[PDB]
């Protein structure tokens, strides 16, 4: 009742909700130093549109730095900045810091409740069970202001919005809160699975924010099931888990020896093939809740294999700037997933990214079917007309609310997990290898790359065509791998050296003429610059036939 109406109101009243939101945002902010600069002295949409510049992160980083260093929030926001969000996006190798306050949590939990309703409208059999949700709290990074920088969901978990969350199936997990709150994710992932297994009959949903993490959970399961079952059998958690909260809370889940349940799970895990393993271990699971769009699409085949084509439900599109909105057709196929922006989240504008829309910038209500755009965000934390760097495509309309397929993050050439390595990053990394090559009597002719997920964990593959005896200097080429990795950003390093979600960077040295042949291949397809990443399977086949040596970082 209330919900059908709530969604009707949100999606029919788009222009006026957006315009009221803008006014709500701008009015108290006229006296901030940032807006004073552009003479926004009263609210007026036309003046905001004429005088407030559309900016990139780098344009306004100087203002952000000052707040990070302890200066008054009102440099940019009359609503007090009480923390920051650590973006997966980076600047000079360091994670971007976006301003944050409780409004972010009000939006987030609003979105959680809305999508909960969307899911329950379309999926039956969930209200009595729990979810085995692979949820992780990360470590924060203190800023000189005394305000912490956290990743988005951690800013939620480390708050009473989470601790005092609603008491219903959607917020009920097989893992104790202590597990979710444990900053050691090697330990918390292990515990997630153990708790999941002990309470396997109650599991009606499983998932994680992103598909990569769901895949890693299953792979870790495949690598740990013997140990997990030993804990279940004895009723004791392995000694190696150090986190006191995990020890205490998981001890209670376990309760005592469960040899019989251990036998049951071992029998399942001992089968010939891991196919359908998630459904076999968790037979009451109704769906998998995880983002399968953007670069996460690469994990869809693996997920279907492990999950016996249980529905993959991809609910939410969001960022460090703002949550955007949700998938109002949760049971659609991963390739047809679009996200309906919610007009109460932030004020949204769009920069056309093809010829289909000749305007310079357009409101949410005005985006055209079939056109791509870059979202531009004005939020409740001191970001005004901020370009987001994602490309989206309008695929439809729910009432008056446009629905958007996520196309890509612009410039990104390599992404396995949370890492997002852009073309510039790659060029820098390759540049370091070049120095190594020069220092060993070689030079680099050309290069390209590829995100390999054919094995776990996934890793970056870089093809190098070198030029000047019986053998390649393996020490030098190994060193090339190392310097490339070392030039990458903190997010890659965390995944690689702490999460183990990314494996050693691999260099594949290719034969003389490889990249000339590559060029021949592409122009035979119709076509020039060597692409900096390859996503065509045929081109990839061409490269592979050219490989003469393989090296790995470490
Ligand atoms: N549902 C989704 N589908 C595809 N890409 C997403 C989704 N949610 C987030 N992303 C990507 O992750 C970025 C957010 O990074 P962050 O600043 O770390 O929160 C977005 O701008 C997108 O590039």
Q: Which of 56, 57, 84, 88 to mutate to test the pocket of ligand 1 (most atoms within 8 A of CB)?
A: 88
Non-local (6+) Cβ contacts of 296 within 8 A are: 210, 211, 212, 290
Q: 404 CA distance to ligand 1 centroid (A)?
A: 13
Contact assessment for residue 148 and residue 173, using Cβ atoms and an 8 Å cutoff: no
Q: In angstroms, rounded to a whole number, what is the distance separating the alpha carbons of residues 361 and 384?
A: 14
b/e for 264-297, b at 16 or more Cβ within 10 A?
bbbebbeeeeeebbbbbbbebbbbbbbbbbbbbb
Contact between 488 and 428 under an 8 Å Cβ cutoff? The reply is no
Cβ atoms 192, 200 nearer than 8 A: no
Q: Which residue in 76, 180, 192, 190 sits closest to 136, CA to CA?
A: 180
Residue 414, beta-bridge partner list: 421
φ/ψ of residue 356, rounded to 5: -65, -20
Atom of ligand 1 nearest to the CA of 88: 18
318 Cα: distance to centroid of ligand 1 (angstroms): 6
Neighbours of 486 (CB within 10 A): 12
**Which residue is listed with tokens 């949590």?**
105
Q: Report d(CA 282, CA 259) in Å as an integer.
A: 18
d(CA 132, CA 307): 14
320 pocket-lining for ligand 1 (C-beta < 6 Å) = yes
β-strand pairing of 316-318 with 323-326? antiparallel
What's the rounded Cα separation, in Å, for the pair 341 and 14? 10
Question: What are 159's two structure tokens?
Answer: 């708050």
Nearest-atom number in ligand 1 for the CA of 98 is 17
Instruction: For residue 501, give every residue at least 6 positions away whose Cβ sits within 8 Å of its Cβ, in sequence order, or none.
Output: 212, 213, 216, 416, 417, 418, 457, 458, 495
d(C-alpha 219, C-alpha 333), whole Å: 24
Q: Supply the residue whose CA is at minimum distance from atom 20 of ligand 1.
A: 319
Residue minimizing CA distance to atom 15 of ligand 1: 319
Alpha helices per DSSP H over 52-96:
57-68
Q: Which of 246, 112, 107 is nearest to 166 (CA)?
A: 112
Distances (CA, A) of 22 to 25, 43, 48, 51: 5, 9, 9, 15
Task: State how far the alpha carbon of 382 is from the alpha carbons of 64, 67, 121, 346, in Å.
Answer: 9, 10, 36, 11
Cis peptide bond prior to 457, omega within 30° of 0:
yes
In degrees to the nearest 10, what's the CA dihedral of 354, 359, 365, 370? -20
- Token code pair at residue 398: 């729910």
Q: Which two tokens stand for residue 422?
A: 């852009």
For the sheet containing 141-142, what is the strand order? 94-100, 83-91, 148-150, 141-142
For ligand 1, mutation pick of 108, 319, 491 (most atoms within 8 Å of CB) = 319
Distance CA 64, CA 96 (A): 10
Q: Which atom of ligand 1 is nearest to the CA of 291?
A: 1
Using H for helix, E for strand and C for coil, what is the string for 391-436? Answer: EEEEEEEECCEEEEEEEEECCEEECCCCCCEEHHHHHHHHHHHHHH
Q: Which residues belong to the annotated binding site for AMP?
A: 87-88, 293, 316, 320, 339, 390, 409
Residue 443 CB partners (closer than 8 Å, separation 6+): 434, 437, 466, 467
CA distances 486 to 204, 208, 497, 505, Å, are 42, 29, 11, 10
Q: Is 422 in the pocket of ligand 1 (CB under 6 A)?
A: no
* Measured distance between the N- and C-terminal CA atoms of the chain, rounded to whole angstroms: 58
Q: Which two tokens stand for residue 10?
A: 């949100």
Alpha carbon nearest to ligand 1 atom 2, residue: 317
Q: Distance between CA atoms of 537 and 145, rounded to whole angstroms?
A: 49
Q: Which atom of ligand 1 sits closest to the CA of residue 152?
A: 19
| CA-CA-CA-CA torsion sign (265, 271, 276, 277) | positive
Which two structure tokens, joined as six digits, stand for 472? 């390649």
Domain tally, the chain: 1
Q: Is 490 exposed, middle or buried (0-12, 13-18, 19+ CB in 10 A)?
A: middle
Token pair, residue 18, equals 């957006």
Q: In this structure, which residue's CA is closest to atom 14 in ligand 1?
A: 319
CB atoms within 10 A of CB 474: 10
Is the separation of the CB atoms in 206 and 196 below 8 Å?
yes
| CA nearest neighbour of 99 among 113, 85, 114 | 85
Spacing, Cα 273 to ligand 1 middle (Å)? 33
Output phi, psi for 103, to 5 deg.
-60, -30
Q: Say which DSSP state 54 is in.
A: P
All residues at 6 or more sequence positions from 323 whose CB lies less than 8 Å from its CB, including other chains: 107, 108, 111, 316, 317, 342, 345
Backbone angles phi, psi at 480, to 5 degrees: -55, -50
Tokens for 124? Answer: 């039956």
d(CA 397, CA 137): 35
How was this entry determined? X-ray
How far lies 474's CA from each of 12, 123, 438, 481, 549, in Å?
A: 63, 55, 15, 11, 9
Ligand 1 within 6 A of 95 CB? no
Closest C-alpha to 251, from 266, 240, 264, 238: 238
Half-sphere exposure of 505 (CA within 13 A, CB side): 30
**462 close to 552: Cβ distance less than 8 angstroms:** no
Q: Which atom in ligand 1 lies closest to the alpha carbon of residue 412?
A: 23
Cα separation, 519 vs 266, whole angstroms: 52
Nearest-atom index, ligand 1, CA of 324: 8
* CA 329, chain centre distance (Å): 21
> Among the atoms of ligand 1, which is closest to the Cα of residue 389?
21
Q: State how far the Cα of 86 lies from the Cα of 92, in Å rounded to an integer.
A: 14
Per-residue tokens: 87: 């973006």
Distance CA 355, CA 348 (A): 20
Sequence-distant (6+) residues with CB within 8 A of 50 are none
Q: Are 67 and 24 in contact (CB under 8 A)?
A: no
- Cβ atoms of 419 and 489 within 8 Å: the answer is yes
Q: After which residues is the chain broken (C to N over 2.5 A)?
A: 468, 527
In short, whether 484's Cβ falls inside 6 Å of ligand 1 is no
Radius of gyration of the chain (CA): 25
Q: 451 - beta bridge partners?
A: 460
Cβ(199)–Cβ(129) under 8 Å?
no
Determine whether the shortest distance from the Cβ of 383 to ligand 1 is under 6 A: no
- Which protein residue's CA is at the shortest distance from atom 5 of ligand 1? 294
Structure tokens at 202: 């109650």
d(CA 125, CA 160): 29
Domain hosting residue 519, numbered range: 1-554
Residue 196 contacts residue 180 (beta carbons within 8 Å): no
223 CB neighbour count, 10 Å cutoff: 10
Q: Which helix (H) or strand (E) holds 326?
A: strand 323-326
Q: Give the residue from 192, 189, 196, 184 showing the smallest Cα distance to 242.
A: 184
Do the beta carbons of residue 543 and residue 514 sit within 8 Å?
Answer: yes
Q: Please indicate whether residue 463, judged by its CB atom, sits closer than 6 Å to ligand 1.
A: no
CB 49 within 8 A of CB 359: no
Q: What 8-state DSSP symbol labels residue 55?
A: B
Ligand 1 atom 4 nearest Cα: 294
């Amino acid at each position: 009742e209330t919900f059908e109406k709530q969604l009707k109101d949100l999606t029919s009243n788009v222009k006026s909700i957006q315009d009221n939101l803008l006014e709500e945002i701008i009015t108290p902010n006229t006296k901030t130093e940032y807006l004073q600069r552009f003479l926004i002295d009263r609210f007026d949409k036309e003046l905001f549109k004429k005088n407030v510049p559309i900016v990139s992160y780098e344009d306004i980083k100087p203002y952000l730095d000052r707040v990070v260093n302890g200066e008054s929030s009102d440099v940019i926001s009359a609503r007090t900045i009480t923390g920051f969000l650590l973006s997966s996006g980076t600047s000079g190798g360091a994670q971007k810091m976006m301003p944050w306050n409780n409004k972010y949590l009000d939006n987030l939990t609003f979105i959680y409740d809305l999508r909960m309703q969307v899911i329950t409208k379309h999926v039956k059999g969930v209200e009595e069970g729990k979810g085995m949700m692979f949820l992780f709290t990360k470590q924060e990074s203190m800023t000189p202001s005394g305000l912490p920088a956290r990743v988005a969901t951690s800013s939620y978990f480390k708050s009473d919005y989470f601790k005092n969350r609603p008491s219903n199936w959607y917020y009920s997990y097989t893992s104790p809160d202590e597990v979710i709150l444990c900053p050691n994710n090697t330990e918390s992932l292990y515990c997630h699975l153990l708790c999941g297994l002990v309470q396997r009959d109650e599991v009606v949903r499983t998932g994680s924010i992103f598909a990569s993490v769901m895949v890693r959970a299953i792979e870790v399961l495949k690598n740990s099931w013997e140990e997990l079952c030993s804990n279940i059998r004895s009723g004791h958690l392995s000694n190696w888990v150090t986190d006191l909260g995990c020890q205490n809370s998981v001890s209670l889940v376990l309760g005592g020896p469960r040899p019989e349940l251990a036998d049951t799970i071992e029998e399942i895990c001992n089968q010939n093939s891991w196919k359908g393993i998630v459904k076999r271990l968790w037979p009451n699971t109704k769906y998998i809740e995880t983002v399968v769009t953007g670069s996460m699409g690469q994990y869809v085949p693996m997920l279907n294999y492990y999950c016996n084509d249980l529905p993959l439900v991809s609910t939410t599109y969001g960022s460090s700037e703002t949550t955007f909105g949700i998938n109002l057709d949760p049971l659609c196929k991963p390739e047809d997933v679009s996200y309906t922006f919610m007009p109460n989240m932030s004020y949204f504008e769009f920069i056309p990214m093809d010829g289909g829309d000749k305007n310079d910038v357009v409101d949410l209500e005005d985006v055209k079917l079939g056109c791509t755009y870059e979202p531009v965000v004005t939020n409740f934390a001191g970001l005004y007309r901020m370009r987001v760097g994602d490309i989206v495509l309008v695929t439809g309309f729910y009432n008056n609310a446009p629905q958007f397929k996520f196309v890509r993050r612009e410039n990104v050439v390599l992404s396995i997990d949370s890492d997002k390595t852009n073309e510039e990053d790659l060029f820098k990394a390759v540049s370091q290898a070049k120095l190594v090559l020069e220092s060993s009597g070689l030079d680099l002719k050309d290069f390209t790359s590829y995100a390999d997920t054919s094995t776990f964990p996934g890793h970056y593959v870089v093809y190098l065509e070198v030029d000047t005896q019986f053998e390649l200097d393996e020490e030098a080429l190994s060193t090339c791998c190392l310097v490339m990795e070392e030039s990458l950003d903190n997010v890659y390093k965390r995944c690689r050296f702490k999460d183990g979600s990314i494996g050693p960077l691999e260099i594949r040295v290719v034969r003389q003429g490889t990249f000339d042949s590559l060029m021949d291949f592409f122009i035979s397809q119709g076509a020039y610059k060597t692409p900096r990443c390859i996503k065509s399977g045929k081109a990839l086949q061409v490269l592979e036939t050219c490989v003469v040596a393989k090296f790995f970082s470490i």
